[PDB]
Every structure is written in structure tokens, then in C-alpha cells.
Amino acid sequence: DYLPTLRKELMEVLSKYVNVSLDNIRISQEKQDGMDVLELNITL
Amino acid sequence: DYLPTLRKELMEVLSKYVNVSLDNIRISQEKQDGMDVLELNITL
Numbered sequence: 001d002y003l004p005t006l007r008k009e010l011m012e013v014l015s016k017y018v019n020v021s022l023d024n025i026r027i028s029q030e031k032q033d034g035m036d037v038l039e040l041n042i043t044l
Numbered sequence: 045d046y047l048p049t050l051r052k053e054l055m056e057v058l059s060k061y062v063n064v065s066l067d068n069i070r071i072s073q074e075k076q077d078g079m080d081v082l083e084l085n086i087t088l
Contacts, residue, residue: 003088006061010084013057017050040054040084044047 003029003038010040018044047073047082054084062088 011025020042027040055069064086071084 003062009061010054010058014054017053018047036088038084038086038088040082042082044080044082 003036007038007040010038014040014042018042047080051082051084054082058084058086062086 007027011022014025015022025042029038051071055066058069059066069086073082
């Protein structure tokens, strides 16, 4: 609900920075070592 | 000049989403397989 939405928001912001589409952007939400870590990747 | 700036911009946007500081955000710019891949990480 919360972060998942913010993750989409991050994608949109990035797509505007390098003027690509959302299909070229990947973002993952994972729980490791007890913590919730977001990872946002893009290939240019 | 270009992406390095956008990388900082990404950090700022993320810090506002989860209302943290820039010190809790990491972002890397690396060349792998001939391509330039940005990686933005945050621990929550």
C-alpha cells in the first residue's frame, strides 16, 4: 500500500530524468537481515 | 555532469518519500556489459 506506491513513484521520477518508459525500469522490495531494502535499477 | 546530477536528484526525491536524510541513501553508477547501470538503494 505505502512503499509499493512510492516505488512506482520512484519509477516515474526516473523515467522523466532520462526520458525513458516504465518498461525500462526495475524496482524491488526485499526483506534481508530484518530490514526492508528498496532497490531501483536502470540500464542506460 | 549529467547523470551524476540526476543521481543526486534521485536521492533527494527518495529522502522525501520516506522522510529520511541523504546519509541513509546510496546510489552507484557502474559500467557493466558495455552498458551504464544506475543502482539506488535504501534500508528501511
